[PDB]
Design an enzyme around this catalytic site. Structure first.
Site, PDB file in Angstrom:
ATOM      1  N   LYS B 161      63.313 -49.973 -25.899  1.00  0.00           N
ATOM      2  CA  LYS B 161      62.462 -49.403 -24.876  1.00  0.00           C
ATOM      3  C   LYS B 161      63.069 -48.247 -24.412  1.00  0.00           C
ATOM      4  O   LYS B 161      64.007 -48.127 -23.560  1.00  0.00           O
ATOM      5  CB  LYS B 161      62.025 -50.286 -23.876  1.00  0.00           C
ATOM      6  CG  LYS B 161      60.715 -49.935 -22.963  1.00  0.00           C
ATOM      7  CD  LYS B 161      59.439 -50.289 -23.596  1.00  0.00           C
ATOM      8  CE  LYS B 161      58.370 -49.403 -23.193  1.00  0.00           C
ATOM      9  NZ  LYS B 161      56.884 -49.743 -24.002  1.00  0.00           N
ATOM     10  N   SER B 231      60.091 -47.628 -28.712  1.00  0.00           N
ATOM     11  CA  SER B 231      58.752 -47.764 -28.060  1.00  0.00           C
ATOM     12  C   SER B 231      59.042 -47.024 -26.542  1.00  0.00           C
ATOM     13  O   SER B 231      59.977 -47.222 -25.739  1.00  0.00           O
ATOM     14  CB  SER B 231      58.089 -48.907 -27.689  1.00  0.00           C
ATOM     15  OG  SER B 231      57.089 -48.905 -27.022  1.00  0.00           O
TER      16      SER B 231
END
Lengths: 357, 365, 364, 363
Positions: B161, B231
């Site tokens: 992330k 992501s």
């Protein structure tokens, strides 16, 4: 003796005639022997999709000028079936079918054969009804005779161009005291496709007459053809004949759902392609695709029918094109959407044209 | 001894927690042992996709109430990685990763292992640049230690992330006399994903340090990782890292294997990844727990020399088409469209291709 | 004496509660007096539009924490109507309706009043049929009583939350030997919206009952209400009714007026609704609190004899085009695109048109 | 003496020529006197929108057969400007510009006048750069001379069909050792539109040359023309210029006026353009022949301080939304959705706004 040749031609745009022009100018195709052109054009595949007409107009203009005839005569002589929607990795292209009369012996076994037939005009109150089924069936039988194919098991593709309803034709029907099957031009397209496919199945003996009725023509999805491909009568029958000198064959299977790669491989094997290393002998793959009414694939939910951004036939074309490309290693294949009574619910026929060994 | 369990749970909607609640209430999952949830959610998969945040908010609420803690603590304790966009036949779902400390011997050979690591917070001017690469590499090494994986060949999935740029952080950088890599939030997402994936590749020895530079971080598409999956999202402070691999010191009934799709229709790479996870024939497909893959439209506008319209289509965004395509290919290989496909693969597999991993149950263990 | 206050709050995202929280923290809104929130949220306005639920969930969480009660009770106490789709220049926002009981005389004339009522749950086989019409009419009358409005001409907005069909409810109906109006969830949404709007029209005397029948509920487009605004439910299984109008027994510093857009470009109806709310010239626009309108594509495929592609466009759904169009028209009249426009107008205004109401401050 | 006639014709599809054929067959238009056709066609208005070329091909065929000349000559003789995208309530249609030389006295005052000019071909490395600005300016001055218009304040519309880069031209530039303004055909359309509009502004004296540079050509949005309307396309070469204005030496029964929309909901600018075209009250609306306008999404993502999602929607392109919005606003002012709205207004009005012109009948 009949010899069928098939040319798969990449296109740069709906109006791109350069690949066809190259094949005519090199002497590989006599344009007077072209009998059909089946395109994938890169518009949205919608009602208001004019790329299909742009492609048809451009090819008819080019061929008319090469042949010294009018556009009207070319459109009267050559079937133009343009399937919109090139979603995913699907490559825009045209597949040109040429039929020559050559005086030469056939080759071992059966080889590719093509026949053409037209039905009578339908009244608006006849669309989506038993009269269309029966007239299509008759025309299909005539096209089989034209192809010198007597065994329905040797028919591998039945391509149909079928009519539709407009508001003006509905008003004509009303004026004459008749009701139409549905007061909706777009839904009328679905009814015409379904009636035409049931007529094909009837002609080939895939379903029995006692099971077909008007009420069934949009309702009983257990009734379907394994070779019909209909588009909104002109009929092209494609199969194999012992009386053919074609260096090609056609085979087919039926996709049970949108990810049924097994059916793709079965269609490949049926066309004489027995291993992955023979893939290069494929001339083209032609398939129908659709979203299953259940909203699932093999019990797995998808959003195809809920997605207001992407229409479901676009997604189904993209999906099945991806599956076929992954089996055969090539995304330049023909996938057409809207399969009413064409294969099972959520599936569709798939055929392969391949060179012989 | 560490045991990793992985549960793939169909969802009826972005906020559907019923399958997870069922696994908790039946005793199969202790919610306190959940370490990560990776979802495919059925929004449009873009910037303005709020189905992801909706799923995360709903899970954080549910888990906070199950654990008797605040949502903030649940979100501090559990990784929530939500990939929007379920195009084609792709089935919305969540994959829940649970790590238990169980008193049972390790299984013979290597078995599923998971490790966790966090980077320092980044200054806005560091995103998409070598500082992020290097910090990601360090954190990946720490996560491998957490996973008890010493061999990079045993790393099969690196989930990140990563941050992005907003207007306020760009203005902060300007105020401090610094320039940022791009004055564009979406391209900043691409730069953050790419720098993070290159940091993974650096940490694992997939590329050599001497080949990596700032100018390479978006330009040289020959530099890529074969296991990185990155992501971008809301939080955007520190890179969060999940390393998934196999360890000899694990008592998991699962293994992970991987390959790389060469293009969007590379079913062969799907088969290679399946075999690497111990599935050697079609009849073993049922041992799959999940498939995790990256997909994208190739910059050339072609697949194996054949033109497509993905990058020209103003109706369907190209990553939507690519997700649909690669999900369809995988589904046709494995017989199940409920697999994870995530878009935007900067330095993750080749241009137009992407990593593909399989988590599968072992056989006769 | 009842006093209704209305607050129009810009939002940055579906889950953005910051503007409402700021108004609560300043003492301008007592959350216990909130009775309804009507939002425009920025999803695609379709079946798979979860921004509406995200907005409702986020607001219910915020209010539960502010009020010290559970989310379930908050959703039981306050109407949450989230209209997805903010196409064109339409600005996402929420409109919060607060009703207080204040001890003050009756303001001169009539002033804003709001009432709320709920119907019984419907069986799946009741959607789109006369039983739904009749129950909706009953509920509209009950909400009018709650608002202390006796004259149906004084109803200016009837907001409805209605059920829809799912596969499980259709199977339940089938098991008991009954058939539903359509075996299609989206069309079921259209049938539920249309029956609810006809129930409003029936309760208010806008159409007479013998002309309404099941076959009439989606076929006869000459039957419509001029104040009804109905919306299929996200997750609840019933109708929730908010009647908004004016009452002589109100101390509000606001009024509502309305007109009906005859077609998607009827700016005259916008100005007529403005005049009905006391806005008689462009220079009074600043007294607008909000504009609320229904929009749709006319079935004819034309506007004033001019063809359009809204119903043929496979890229953009027709309700999206209608919302963009009518919001743009309203914005061009009032100088502000932050107004409420909701799509799918079955039996709500004429074919191709829809009701349009304006809430504006008084000048006394 | 010059006479301009303008005919607004509804169309049923991109290839529908029936209304034009009816106007020719009735004697209202001599096709040999047709100088331009400006269409709204019902495709999606994107890259892969072929309805525009479909319309052009169909009209060129029809006119070639009516005139007894080749399609190439028809396309050389008649301007074909096809704006795809009929979003919202916008109605597909064509606007036919006919220019006759009639022996009749000069109308009192100024009346509609039209002039035409072509530029030289451009090298790929010239698009989006000052060379395009300057050549457009030259052609605009030539078109003003052709129109018998000497005062730029009397120019109300400058329609340009301007070029773009293709892969073949980029490769040509590369072979010759040159770089192009952008190595992207779609973005090249924006650069060509913007350079052409700045060239219009330069020719008419609306901006000064010293304020124009390459860095400004896609960056400084305070520099714009209030009358330029520019359009790029694959279908046909893009070396065409049309100047439309009013001249004292014209015998026409029409006039043109214009304003500039400050934002996408600026109905006041619509009313101002109507009044500027001689329409002084609502009851004279029927004298409108057509309205021609530019629309766009503002870079701020807001209109008058109110946020919108136009620039965030990955399903509907932002120019589609802007066309729908501005068509709806104009239709609500004039009572008719069959008006011309074209998207992509680089250096055409302010950021988020655009020129709007009205061609109207005299009384």
């Amino acid at each position: 003796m009949q010899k069928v040749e098939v040319f798969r031609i990449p296109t740069a745009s709906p109006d791109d005639i350069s690949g066809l022009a190259t094949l005519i100018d090199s002497g590989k195709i006599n344009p007077a022997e072209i009998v059909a052109i089946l395109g994938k054009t890169e518009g949205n595949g919608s009602v208001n999709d004019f790329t299909r007409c742009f492609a048809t107009q451009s090819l008819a203009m080019y061929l008319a000028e090469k042949l010294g005839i009018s556009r009207e005569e070319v459109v009267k002589k050559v079937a133009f079936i343009m399937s919109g929607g090139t979603e995913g990795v699907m490559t825009p292209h045209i597949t040109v079918f040429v039929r020559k009369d050559v005086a030469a012996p056939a080759a071992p076994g059966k080889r590719l054969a093509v026949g053409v037939a037209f039905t009578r005009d339908f009244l608006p109150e006849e669309l989506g009804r038993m009269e269309q089924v029966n007239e299509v069936a008759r025309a299909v039988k005539e096209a089989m005779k034209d192809a010198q194919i007597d065994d329905p098991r040797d028919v591998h593709f039945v391509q149909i161009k079928a009519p539709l309803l407009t508001a003006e034709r509905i008003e004509d029907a009303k004026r004459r005291g008749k009701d139409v099957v549905v007061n909706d031009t777009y839904k009328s397209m679905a009814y015409s496709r379904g009636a035409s496919a049931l007529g094909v199945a009837l002609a080939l003996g895939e379903i029995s007459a006692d099971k077909i009725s008007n009420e069934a023509i949009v309702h009983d999805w257990n009734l379907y053809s394994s070779v019909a491909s209909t588009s909104a009568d002109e009929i092209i029958v494609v199969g194999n004949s012992t009386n053919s000198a074609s260096d090609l064959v056609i085979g087919h299977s039926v996709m049970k759902d949108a990810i049924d790669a097994d059916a793709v491989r079965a269609a490949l094997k049926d066309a004489g392609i027995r291993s992955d290393d023979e893939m290069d002998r494929i001339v083209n793959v032609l398939a129908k695709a659709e979203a299953a009414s259940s909203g699932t694939v093999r019990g797995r939910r998808n959003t195809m029918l809920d997605d207001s951004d992407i229409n479901h036939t676009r997604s189904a074309r993209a999906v099945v094109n991806a599956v076929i490309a992954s089996v055969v290693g090539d995304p330049m294949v023909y996938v057409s959407g809207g399969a009413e009574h064409q294969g099972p619910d959520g599936g569709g026929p798939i055929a392969v044209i391949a060179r012989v060994l």
